[PDB]
Amino acid sequence: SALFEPYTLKDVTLRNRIAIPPMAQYMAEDGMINDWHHVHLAGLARGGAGLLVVEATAVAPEGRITPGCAGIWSDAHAQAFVPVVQAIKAAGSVPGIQIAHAGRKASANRPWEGDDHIAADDTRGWETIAPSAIAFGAHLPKVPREMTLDDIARVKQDFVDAARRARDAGFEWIELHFAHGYLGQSFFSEHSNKRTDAYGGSFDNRSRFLLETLAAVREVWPENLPLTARFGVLEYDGRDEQTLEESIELARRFKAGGLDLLSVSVGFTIPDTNIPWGPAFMGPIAERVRREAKLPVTSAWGFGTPQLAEAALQANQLDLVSVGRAHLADPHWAYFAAKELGVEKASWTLPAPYAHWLE
Amino acid sequence: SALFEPYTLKDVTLRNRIAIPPMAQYMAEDGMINDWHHVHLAGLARGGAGLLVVEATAVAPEGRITPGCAGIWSDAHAQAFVPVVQAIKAAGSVPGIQIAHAGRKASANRPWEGDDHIAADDTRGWETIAPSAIAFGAHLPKVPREMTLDDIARVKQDFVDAARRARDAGFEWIELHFAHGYLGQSFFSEHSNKRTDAYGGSFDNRSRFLLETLAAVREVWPENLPLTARFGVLEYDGRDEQTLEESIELARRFKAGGLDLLSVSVGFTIPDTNIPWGPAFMGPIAERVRREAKLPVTSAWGFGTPQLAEAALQANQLDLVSVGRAHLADPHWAYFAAKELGVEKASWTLPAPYAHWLE
Numbered sequence: 001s002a003l004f005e006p007y008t009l010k011d012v013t014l015r016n017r018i019a020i021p022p023m024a025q026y027m028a029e030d031g032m033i034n035d036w037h038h039v040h041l042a043g044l045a046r047g048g049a050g051l052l053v054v055e056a057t058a059v060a061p062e063g064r065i066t067p068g069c070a071g072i073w074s075d076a077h078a079q080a081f082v083p084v085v086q087a088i089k090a091a092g093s094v095p096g097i098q099i100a101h102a103g104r105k106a107s108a109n110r111p112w113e114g115d116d117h118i119a120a121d122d123t124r125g126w127e128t129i130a131p132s133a134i135a136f137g138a139h140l141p142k143v144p145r146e147m148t149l150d151d152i153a154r155v156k157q158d159f160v161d162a163a164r165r166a167r168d169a170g171f172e173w174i175e176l177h178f179a180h181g182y183l184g185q186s187f188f189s190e191h192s193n194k195r196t197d198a199y200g201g202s203f204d205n206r207s208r209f210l211l212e213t214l215a216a217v218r219e220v221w222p223e224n225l226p227l228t229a230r231f232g233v234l235e236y237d238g239r240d241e242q243t244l245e246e247s248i249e250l251a252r253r254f255k256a257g258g259l260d261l262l263s264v265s266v267g268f269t270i271p272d273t274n275i276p277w278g279p280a281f282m283g284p285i286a287e288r289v290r291r292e293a294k295l296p297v298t299s300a301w302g303f304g305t306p307q308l309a310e311a312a313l314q315a316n317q318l319d320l321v322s323v324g325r326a327h328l329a330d331p332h333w334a335y336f337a338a339k340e341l342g343v344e345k346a347s348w349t350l351p352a353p354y355a356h357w358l359e
Numbered sequence: 360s361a362l363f364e365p366y367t368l369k370d371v372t373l374r375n376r377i378a379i380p381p382m383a384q385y386m387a388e389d390g391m392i393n394d395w396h397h398v399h400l401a402g403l404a405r406g407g408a409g410l411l412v413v414e415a416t417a418v419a420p421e422g423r424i425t426p427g428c429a430g431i432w433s434d435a436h437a438q439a440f441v442p443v444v445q446a447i448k449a450a451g452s453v454p455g456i457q458i459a460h461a462g463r464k465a466s467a468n469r470p471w472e473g474d475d476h477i478a479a480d481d482t483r484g485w486e487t488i489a490p491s492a493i494a495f496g497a498h499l500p501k502v503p504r505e506m507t508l509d510d511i512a513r514v515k516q517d518f519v520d521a522a523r524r525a526r527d528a529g530f531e532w533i534e535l536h537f538a539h540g541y542l543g544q545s546f547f548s549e550h551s552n553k554r555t556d557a558y559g560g561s562f563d564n565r566s567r568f569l570l571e572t573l574a575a576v577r578e579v580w581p582e583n584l585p586l587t588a589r590f591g592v593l594e595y596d597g598r599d600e601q602t603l604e605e606s607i608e609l610a611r612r613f614k615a616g617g618l619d620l621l622s623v624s625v626g627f628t629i630p631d632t633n634i635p636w637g638p639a640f641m642g643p644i645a646e647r648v649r650r651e652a653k654l655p656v657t658s659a660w661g662f663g664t665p666q667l668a669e670a671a672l673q674a675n676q677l678d679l680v681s682v683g684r685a686h687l688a689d690p691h692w693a694y695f696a697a698k699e700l701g702v703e704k705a706s707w708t709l710p711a712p713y714a715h716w717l718e
């Protein structure tokens with residue numbers, strides 16, 4: 001099986017092509033992770049996936065999506081990850097982390113607590129920041145504050161500090177969160193970026209925050225560990241061909257600036273869109289990016305059916321298959337997939353105290 | 360669904376009828392549990408089962424099955440369980456523990472490291488103790504040492520200390536391991552017990568170690584927390600009707616001595632047997648014990664098919680259904696079972712950070 005072939009990128013070797021993408025848990029307190037995350041992540045790692053990417057972890061307090069989001073904006077925050085990283089490595093999975101800044105979508109309720117912007121007089125909330133003072137709309141009506149040049153320098157440096165901390169906590173894979181309508185994505189999109197300075201207008205200017213952040217992170221992130229980003233390459237907003245062309249051009253620039261792999265997503269920059277949800281629907285768009293930017297890729301949405309994952313790899317649409325919700329349902333999904341795809345000694349996807357009994 | 364009705368025994372209420380029976384992990388070091396067990400057990404608890412019974416935990420070093428077995432023979436051993444107990448309670452499952460002494464089956468290799476008695480000159484091994492100096496045979500050929508009366512008093516006191524420690528570590532459910540051919544089972548069986556003193560010969564004498572151990576444990580175990588035992592009620596050795604009759608009589612004595620529930624098993628006292636393995640094969644034997652001893656029961660073997668579990672409960676064969684291997688395959692089996700049996704809002708079998716997304 002393609003799904004169970006190892007993958008080497010820089011000095012890191014994944015035991016198979018199953019990636020667990022970042023999945024926010026909304027269980028942290030003032031950014032500090034706890035035994036929710038420890039058990040969740042260690043249990044996932046033991047399930048057999050080759051790569052486990054920790055959830056969106058805020059580079060600054062105001063960059064959290066919600067009051068439950070994980071953070072890495074101080075060394076004490078980073079320390080809390082050390083035992084989790086060590087547990088993921090003990091299980092033979094590669095520990096990764098997505099570092100993030102929610103931008104205008106920040107200061108929101110947890111998804112099961114309303115999923116909407118927090119009320120102005122709720123003591124948990126905070127002012128959001130963004131390229132331009134324009135609301136997302138819908139359930140996120142808060143107008144963010146337009147960033148100053150010093151705000152841009154400060155957030156870039158927060159990404160650097162976050163990557164340095166990730167490195168020193170022992171992560172072997174980093175993912176910059178430039179997708180899903182959060183800060184980075186919103187600098188790229190003309191929908192959310194109306195700036196008239198060096199960080200808006202032209203393609204070069206809209207790309208600038210993302211390229212500068214990548215370059216700054218590259219200074220502290222070891223050249224021998226994969227440097228990745230997640231990026232929304234289209235919006236399904238009636239501007240898809242033009243948006244894809246520009247997104248692919250930016251992916252070429254990312255590659256030239258040392259990006260090792262791109263996690264290809266949808267932008268979610270604005271609500272008025274028509275996304276054609278379906279099993280593996282991103283496969284063709286991921287394949288186009290892979291081909292036209294000559295960059296390895298992963299993507300997600302509906303690959304919990306093992307045969308879809310296998311088919312995407314065999315068709316060279318993806319290099320890794322990211323499988324999210326199926327892993328919340330069953331932390332041992334990789335074992336399920338191994339059985340489905342006829343892997344010999346499938347139960348040894350799991351550690352011995354499980355594997356021995358499941359032959 | 361019957362499977363998802365709560366169950367109250369003494370002051371403890373289980374949120375459903377799914378029990379995770381004790382399952383040895385063979386991952387402890389000198390009896391001390393570690394983050395293997397922490398993550399394994401906390402992850403299981405979060406999966407939704409109402410009751411999680413920790414693996415056979417040795418009351419004394421020589422009572423371990425293997426060098427990987429958990430122990431509770433000192434206060435420092437008991438301390439290692441405290442954070443695990445607290446994590447199980449945080450997940451809403453009831454924490455139980457099986458306390459044990461492997462008897463003549465002790466000093467064995469881990470199951471994936473040969474599963475057989477450890478060689479005499481291996482520095483990990485130890486002398487085994489038993490009612491009589493008779494080997495199990497087959498892959499367990501070591502002849503144990505015949506216990507003295509002082510050995511019997513000492514092992515009883517080790518069970519007491521173990522139960523006291525379990526109590527103080529916060530366990531809410533205890534299970535005495537009188538099954539599977541280990542020490543307690545071997546005192547009951549005429550195959551393994553040839554003693555000529557007060558602890559062998561007659562039914563009363565063969566019962567004596569088990570009844571005295573239960574009574575001694577009862578002195579330190581809170582009356583408001585379930586006091587249970589696992590016991591092999593037949594061997595499939597051509598003596599089943601006589602053996603079942605005596606086993607049921609002993610179950611009546613256990614009930615009269617404060618036992619709240621009996622986990623009904625097979626003896627595994629000797630190897631030369633013909634066990635009729637099959638899905639839910641223990642159901643009829645468990646039902647007979649339940650009826651004839653008028654005692655609540657659980658049993659196990661093949662109840663990972665949710666419909667078998669439901670049928671056993673509806674037929675009043677069992678009060679709780681123990682589901683072992685299916686939980687090694689999928690820690691979230693209870694969610695799977697909830698979907699299969701049509702539970703409303705089945706995903707809320709799991710905690711919010713999973714449930715919300717799986718509706």
Ligand SMILES: Cc1cc2nc3c(=O)[nH]c(=O)nc-3n(C[C@H](O)[C@H](O)[C@H](O)COP(=O)(O)O)c2cc1C
Pocket residue numbers: 021022023024025055056098177179180230300301302303304322323324325326712716
């Ligand atoms: C509970 C949950 C939280 C998520 N959190 C994030 C996140 O932290 N970062 C991100 O880039 N995507 C996040 N996503 C998107 C997932 O990484 C993934 O792309 C999506 O679930 C689709 O894959 P699937 O169909 O396999 O679930 C989240 C999805 C879920 C279900």
Ligand SMILES: Cc1cc2nc3c(=O)[nH]c(=O)nc-3n(C[C@H](O)[C@H](O)[C@H](O)COP(=O)(O)O)c2cc1C
Pocket residue numbers: 353357380381382383384414415457536538539589659660661662663681682683684685
């Ligand atoms: C990995 C493993 C370890 C076990 N350890 C014990 C144990 O510690 N104590 C015990 O009484 N039974 C033990 N058993 C028996 C199980 O509790 C259970 O009775 C058996 O697995 C049958 O149920 P199942 O068909 O649902 O797996 C163990 C079984 C397995 C698979």
Ligand SMILES: O=c1ccc2ccccc2o1
Pocket residue numbers: 024056179180
């Ligand atoms: O980047 C993100 C962060 C959280 C999240 C939750 C549900 C679906 C998608 C998501 O994407």
Ligand SMILES: O=c1ccc2ccccc2o1
Pocket residue numbers: 046087090091092350351352394395
């Ligand atoms: O996959 C594994 C195998 C062994 C192990 C030991 C301790 C903790 C985690 C582990 O994970």
Ligand SMILES: O=c1ccc2ccccc2o1
Pocket residue numbers: 304325326327329330716717718
């Ligand atoms: O294995 C699963 C189970 C449930 C589920 C629900 C939504 C999306 C993906 C899923 O995968």
Ligand SMILES: O=c1ccc2ccccc2o1
Pocket residue numbers: 383415538539
């Ligand atoms: O009591 C026990 C202890 C360990 C064990 C392992 C496999 C099957 C049954 C078992 O029973």
Ligand SMILES: O=c1ccc2ccccc2o1
Pocket residue numbers: 035036405446449450451709710711
């Ligand atoms: O089921 C649960 C729900 C919440 C929770 C929080 C911390 C640790 C474990 C938990 O389990």
Ligand SMILES: O=c1ccc2ccccc2o1
Pocket residue numbers: 357358359663684685686688689
């Ligand atoms: O769900 C499962 C999966 C595998 C398995 C193997 C042996 C016994 C029970 C099992 O249950």
